[PDB]
Amino acid sequence: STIEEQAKTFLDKFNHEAEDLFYQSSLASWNYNTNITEENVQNMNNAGDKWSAFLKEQSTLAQMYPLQEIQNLTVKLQLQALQQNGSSVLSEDKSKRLNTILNTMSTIYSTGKVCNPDNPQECLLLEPGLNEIMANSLDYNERLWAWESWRSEVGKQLRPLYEEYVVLKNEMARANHYEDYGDYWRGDYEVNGVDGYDYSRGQLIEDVEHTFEEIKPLYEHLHAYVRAKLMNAYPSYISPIGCLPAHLLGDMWGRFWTNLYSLTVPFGQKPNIDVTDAMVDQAWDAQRIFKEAEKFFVSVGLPNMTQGFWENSMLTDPGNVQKAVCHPTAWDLGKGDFRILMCTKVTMDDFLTAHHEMGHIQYDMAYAAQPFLLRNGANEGFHEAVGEIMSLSAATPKHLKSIGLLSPDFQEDNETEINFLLKQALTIVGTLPFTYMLEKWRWMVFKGEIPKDQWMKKWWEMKREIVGVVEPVPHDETYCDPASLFHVSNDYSFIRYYTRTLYQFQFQEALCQAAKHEGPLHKCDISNSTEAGQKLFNMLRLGKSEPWTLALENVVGAKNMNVRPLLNYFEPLFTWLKDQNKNSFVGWSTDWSPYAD
Amino acid sequence: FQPTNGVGYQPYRVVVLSFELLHAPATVCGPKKSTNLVKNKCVNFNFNG
C-alpha cells in the first residue's frame, strides 16, 4: 500500500534477480580468470553488459522511490546504495568522455613503457621492469633514469587527461550533490540517521589528519633512521638535513620502503623468521596450508569451511595449457559460492596471503545471510583489515611453533624483534604519509584548491613536507606524477589503505585484549581463542548492514579511527628508533633537493 | 541448479510425511514382527491381539 512497502517489494525482487545474475557474472569471471580464452572474454563481456544493464534499470526504477518517507534504515540504505546514479547524472556525452578518459589513463598507466637512450628499441614497462629496477637495483643513475622517464612519458600524456577526468568527476559530484568528487568518495564513509554513530565526509579528513599528526613523531624518527642508513649507503646523494630522493625509496612513488630494508636493516646478522624451509621439509603444499588455515580458524571459533570451496576453488597453478592470473583473490560469487583464486607455492609469503584470502572469504560468508545489497563490507577498509589481521596472526612465531614449522629451539631476542618491527614499519607506515599526502592532494584537486599551474609545484611541496621526500629532478606542470600511480590513473580512492591499516591495528589490539595475550603487541597470537573469534564474528556477520562506526565501536570500543593500537604495536620500535636517531637528524628539509647543489 | 552450485543451492529432494489418525480405522502400521512360533512349552503368546 504505502510507498515504503512497494519499495520493499521492489528491493526483494531486485535482490532475487541480482543473486542469479551476479552468480552468472561471477562464474563467468572465475572461468575467465582460471582460463583466459577468447570465449571467456566473450562471455565475460556478455555477463558484464547484462549485469550493468540490470543494475542501471533497477537504479532508475528505485530513484523514483522517495527516501525521506522510508523509516526502515535497511530499506533506505539499500535504496540509496541502489539509487546512486553516479557519473550517469551528467549527460550521455559527458559521461562517455569521462569513461573514455578513464580508459585512456588506465591504458597509459598500464602500457607506460620507457626506453633507455642507449637503445631506443630496448624499452621496459612499469611492471616488472621499472618496479624491479627501483626495488632491487641500487644504482642511483638507473633508478633516477627510470623514475624521470616514467614521469615524463606517462605524466606529460596523463596531465591533460587527468585534469579533464578530474573536472568531469567534479561536475558529476556537483550534479550528485557533492562539493567535489573528493566529497563524492568521502561519502562512502558517510553515516547518517543513526544517533551517536553518524559520520560526516569532512570527519574523514579530520580523522585522517589527526591520526597522521599522531604518527608524525614516529614517522619522523623512522625517516631519520632510514635517511641515516641511506647516507651509510649513498653519502653523496642524500643530505642528512634534506629530504629523501623520490627514486631512492624502493619504488617509484616512494610508497613502500621495505625494499630499502636490506639497506636499513637494524641487525643484518640476525636471521629472519621464515619457516619456508620447514614447509619444504614437512612437504607442505597449497592444500596443506589451506587445511592449516582452516584448522586455525576453527580454533579461533569460526565455522569449518565448505567443501564446495575445495571442489571449485583453485589452489595451485592450473598447469600451462590454460593461463590464469595467479594473483591472490577471494571470490564471493554468491548463491553459496565461495572460492579462492591463487597459485599457492611453498613459502611464507604465500602462506600469509592465503590466510589473508581465506579470512576475506570468512568475512564474506559471515554476512552472507544479509540481503544482496548488504553482502559487502561496511567500508573499503574493513575487509582488507580483516585479511591483514589474519595474515599477522598467522605470522606470529607462537603459531609457527605450535604447528611445528618453527622449531621450539628457535630463540626470540630483542634484535630479531627490532628487525621484525622495522620491516613491519617499512611495509605499513612507510606509505601512510604518502597515502595521506596523495589523498589530501587529490581532495584539493577535486575541490579545485590547487590550480593547474602549481599542481606539480604543489605536490612536491607536500612530498617534501608531509613525507619528507624530495623529487630527484624538478618536474613542471606537464608532469602528472600523482597519476603515475595506479589509483590516480584509474580513479580509485587511495585513503582506503590508511583506513584499512588503522582498522586492522584497532582490530588486532581488540583481539589481543579479548584473547588476553601477554607480552608485546607484535608477539600477540589469537590461536586457541574462541572468545575473540566469536566477538569478531558478531560484527563480521553484520557486514554493511550496520554503520561501520557501530561495528568499530563493537570491536575496540571507539566510534572513530585512531592510531593508538599502532603506537602500542611500534612502541618498542619507536623507542629503538629514538635511541638510534640521537646522532642522526630527525625530520627533513624541504628546500634541499638532489638537483640543487 | 548447476553441479558447480553452492552447498546450500544444490537441489534437495524432500518428503514430508503427515501421519493423520482421524476417525477412520487404523490402516498403516509397523511390520509387527511375527516371532518364531514355539510350541509344547509354556510361553506367553499374542495372535493378532
From Swiss-Prot, chain A:
Its cofactor is Zn(2+); chloride. Its EC number is 3.4.17.23, 3.4.17.-. It is an enzyme of class 3 (hydrolase). Changing residue 332 to A: No effect on interaction with SARS-CoV spike glycoprotein. N-glycosylation on Asn-72 may limit SARS infectivity. Proteolytic cleavage by ADAM17 generates a secreted form. Also cleaved by serine proteases: TMPRSS2, TMPRSS11D and HPN/TMPRSS1. It is a single-pass type I membrane protein. Keywords: Carboxypeptidase, Cell membrane, Cell projection, Chloride, Cytoplasm, Disulfide bond, Glycoprotein, Host cell receptor for virus entry, Host-virus interaction, Hydrolase, Isopeptide bond, Membrane, Metal-binding, Metalloprotease, Phosphoprotein, Protease, Receptor, Secreted, Signal, Transmembrane, Transmembrane helix, Ubl conjugation, Zinc. Zn(2+) binds at residues 356, 360, 384. Changing residue 201 to D: No effect on interaction with SARS-CoV spike glycoprotein. The extracellular region of the ACE2 enzyme is composed of two domains. The first is a zinc metallopeptidase domain (residues 19-611). The second domain is located at the C-terminus (residues 612-740) and is 48% identical to human collectrin. The cytoplasmic tail contains several linear motifs such as LIR, PDZ-binding, PTB and endocytic sorting signal motifs that would allow interaction with proteins that mediate endocytic trafficking and autophagy. Induction: Up-regulated in failing heart. Expression is induced by IFNA and IFNG. Exposure to cigarette smoke increases expression in lungs. Expression is decreased in nasal and bronchial epithelium of individuals with allergy after allergen challenge. IL13 stimulation decreases expression in nasal and bronchial epithelium. (Microbial infection) In airway epithelial cells, expression is increased upon influenza A virus infection. It is found in: Cell membrane; Cytoplasm; Cell projection, Cilium; Apical cell membrane. Changing residue 221 to Q: No effect on interaction with SARS-CoV spike glycoprotein. Binds 1 zinc ion per subunit. Changing residue 16 to A: Increases slightly the interaction with RBD domain of SARS-CoV-2 spike protein. Changing residue 371 to A: Slightly inhibits interaction with SARS-CoV spike glycoprotein. An engeneered stable, dimeric and secreted receptor with combined mutations that increase the affinity for human coronavirus SARS-CoV-2 spike protein shows potent SARS-CoV and SARS-CoV-2 neutralization in vitro. Changing residue 487 to A: Complete loss of enzyme activity. It comes from Homo sapiens (Human). Regulated by chloride and fluoride, but not bromide. Chloride increases angiotensin I and decreases angiotensin II cleavage. Inhibited by MLN-4760, cFP_Leu, and EDTA, but not by the ACE inhibitors lisinopril, captopril and enalaprilat. Highly potent and selective in vitro ACE2 inhibitors were identified. This is Angiotensin-converting enzyme 2.
Swiss-Prot record, chain B:
It comes from the Viruses. Attaches the virion to the cell membrane by interacting with host receptor, initiating the infection. The major receptor is host ACE2. When S2/S2' has been cleaved, binding to the receptor triggers direct fusion at the cell membrane. When S2/S2' has not been cleaved, binding to the receptor results in internalization of the virus by endocytosis using host TFRC and GRM2 and leading to fusion of the virion membrane with the host endosomal membrane. Alternatively, may use NRP1/NRP2 and integrin as entry receptors. The chain holds residues 497 to 545 of 1273 of the full protein. This is Spike protein S1. The gene is S. Residues 23-45 are annotated as: Disordered. Binds to host ACE2. RBD also interacts with the N-linked glycan on 'Asn-90' of ACE2. Cleavage of S generates a polybasic C-terminal sequence on S1 that binds to host Neuropilin-1 (NRP1) and Neuropilin-2 (NRP2) receptors. Interacts with host integrin alpha-5/beta-1 (ITGA5:ITGB1) and with ACE2 in complex with integrin alpha-5/beta-1 (ITGA5:ITGB1). May interact via cytoplasmic c-terminus with M protein. May interact (via N-terminus) with host bilirubin and biliverdin, thereby preventing antibody binding to the SARS-CoV-2 spike NTD via an allosteric mechanism. Changing residue 23 to P: Increased resistance to human covalescent sera neutralization. It comes from Severe acute respiratory syndrome coronavirus 2.
